[PDB]
Amino acid sequence: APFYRDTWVEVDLDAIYNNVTHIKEFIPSDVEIFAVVKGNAYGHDYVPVAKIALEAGATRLAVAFLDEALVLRRAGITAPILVLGPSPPRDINVAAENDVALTVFQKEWVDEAIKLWDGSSTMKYHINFDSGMGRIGIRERKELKGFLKSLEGAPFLELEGVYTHFATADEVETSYFDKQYNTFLEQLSWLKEFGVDPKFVHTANSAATLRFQGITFNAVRIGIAMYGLSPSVEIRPFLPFKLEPALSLHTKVAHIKQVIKGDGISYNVTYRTKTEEWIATVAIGYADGWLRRLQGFEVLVNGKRVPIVGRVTMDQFMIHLPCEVPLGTKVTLIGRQGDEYISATEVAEYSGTINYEIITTISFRVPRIFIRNGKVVEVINYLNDI
Amino acid sequence: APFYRDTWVEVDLDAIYNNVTHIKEFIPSDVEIFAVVKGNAYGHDYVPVAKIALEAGATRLAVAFLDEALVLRRAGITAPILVLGPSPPRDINVAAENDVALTVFQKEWVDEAIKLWDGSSTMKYHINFDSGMGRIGIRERKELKGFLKSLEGAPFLELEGVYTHFATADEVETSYFDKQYNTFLEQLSWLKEFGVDPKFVHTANSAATLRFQGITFNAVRIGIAMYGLSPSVEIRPFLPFKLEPALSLHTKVAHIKQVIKGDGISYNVTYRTKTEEWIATVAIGYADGWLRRLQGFEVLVNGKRVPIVGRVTMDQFMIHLPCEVPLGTKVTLIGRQGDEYISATEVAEYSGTINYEIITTISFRVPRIFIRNGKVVEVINYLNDI
Ligand SMILES: [Cl-]
Ligand SMILES: [Cl-]
């Protein structure tokens, strides 16, 4: 699969397999893993991550919205897939015909689904209880009650599981998390009172799964830890085993030159050289997700930290090197060169954000190259496929 | 073309056609326009923008790197296409077989292209002179001479044009711009001295074209103004005619609930309600390019500006509304509701960035809907092509 600019993501499928294996070893043997692939598998690519995670013993998959799930099904994947985000009622039949379960938690959604149902297809759903995330899900007892009442008109909807999600499992202090846990217990009690067997319960994300007792239920939902990154800096010290980061981001010196003292670099001349400087250019920019707020950040060239100088542009940025290098010299934005390592977390901290957002926003413009047992096994260039 | 989440980009093809028509009428009638589509046509989608710009009288297209050019060629577009960014020598024969011109400005690129030539292909190229952008291009007299000498060994490489790019055309005060113009003049003189006809010269981006006499040459390269946005706030007062913004971004209320006083919303409970509050949730988040730094930004609901509350998550965010609205209510992130308008510029200013970066980073996840003469003519859902 070809690509024609020397800028690429490298995804180490061994690393993803090892994180999933380690998690599966760490949790009880009767507890399933959803591999959570939403956001183009956190920027690692939907399909290869899904397949490797399954190979490593994840049994189920989860994605943000229905189109993401169809990407998986069109790739030949047959494992269960749950849509975690809210879905409009018009998705009922297409979810059904593609064996995809949806999160459903509103009597109004059920009303509309009854109207839109094509009569040929039953759909599986999970109930989301909002136990303090404030995002989606049922919160109140009366609310749950009317939701169940309306479900009686929809025998084509079939409960497959019930879940909640934690807002603070990545904070050392547990007050809010403990309140969520207690609230969720009350919600499950309501459900049993209304005569509904939850069947299959899941609550824990990466942070909760790696920290807390009695949190596993029937399944956990793993995103960031599968990609080998800590949910936060503050809990890193407390994780039970070493996470192996799966993603790196590289570029090659596309031009190099010596720029006289005082000359300007990039838009609005926000950087001037202070001596005769070696300035390299690389072919990646904010259209690839490498945003302007990274100006001044230090990338790796020949194992040395070297700064991005001048404004980052849509497709290119410049770097001040101490020495001439040849055109083609590898430049690493996330990953390892020699003894040096730039984590997605370090890029995120410089950017004033979190690692999730750094990885997931690496744009579809950038090819992914997949490594397994140390050999390249696949290249995906999403531009090729338009 | 189907999509299964109610979040979308609207691209008004009329606005684009109109901006290009107006630019074409504003510049001299023998001056061509490159339609600049790099970055997924600044978030608007490569192919339909290219097509409508050409229908509108643009005669040529420009992209950042080869793969973007091949998207256009595969869509059956036959107009000239220039790659503006730096390309590896290994690109030589593919760019030839695909009728794509590359930017070429390095002796070493030539030496390498010599090695790599199909012995059959002829490739067209433009010389980039760096007159002060500091990014790529020839800067020196001896450099140019050496470059032209190496070309002697490459009869398969054919000059199509010569260009430079301005770093400061979007600043009121013109000192740096005037120095670039003078440097570029000297550079063209060296080129004439060394026996080369430029053939076809271009220098101006949107801001230069809209401001300056004597700057058109044989063609201008239009990006941001084609999409109907000002290159900066500083020069907006001074543009010769009104720009018509082509892109808006919308979603729907996917959940709505009343949350009691003091309850928390989203990760790390960074927002708690100050009274009993109506909180809506929408299915777009940072994986769509709607980044966490937009927390606190006000979007439009029912013609009213309302705040994003709590952390934006990968696929969803929450909004504090003054009144209950029905599920499915329209939420506009960029665009018009009633008398209210949120420009990409306003989003950028809140974000501490520029409008270019806001539009161009709307993810491949989000479907684009295209409007011509007020009717939908096309939907592109990139996730489908996977
Ligand atoms: Cl949730
Ligand atoms: Cl340039």
Residue numbers in the entry:
A (entry chain A), B (entry chain B): 4 to 389
Please quote the authors directly:
Consistent with other alanine racemases, the tertiary structure of AlrBax is a homodimer formed by head-to-tail-association of two monomers. Residues in the N-terminus (16–245) fold into an eight-stranded α/β barrel, while the C-terminal residues (246–389) and the first 15 N-terminal amino acids are part of a predominantly β-structure. The homodimer displays two active sites, formed by residues from the N-terminus of one monomer and residues from the C-terminus of the other monomer. The PLP cofactor forms a covalent bond to Lys41 and points at the center of the α/β barrel. As previously observed for AlrGst, extra density was present in the active of AlrBax, which we model here as a molecule of acetate. The oxygen atoms from the acetate molecule in our model are within hydrogen bonding distance to the side chain oxygen from Tyr289', the main chain nitrogen from Met317' and, perhaps more importantly, to the side chain nitrogen atom from the catalytic Lys41 residue. One striking difference in the active site involves Asn131, which in other alanine racemases is generally a carbamylated lysine that participates in a hydrogen bond with the residue homologous to Arg138. In AlrBax, however, we note a prominent chloride ion that is located near Arg138 in the active site. As AlrBax lacks the conserved lysine residue necessary for carbamylation it has apparently drafted a chloride ion to fill the same role for this species. Our analyses of both structures suggest that despite differences in space group and crystal lattice, reductive methylation does not significantly alter the structure of alanine racemase from B. anthracis.
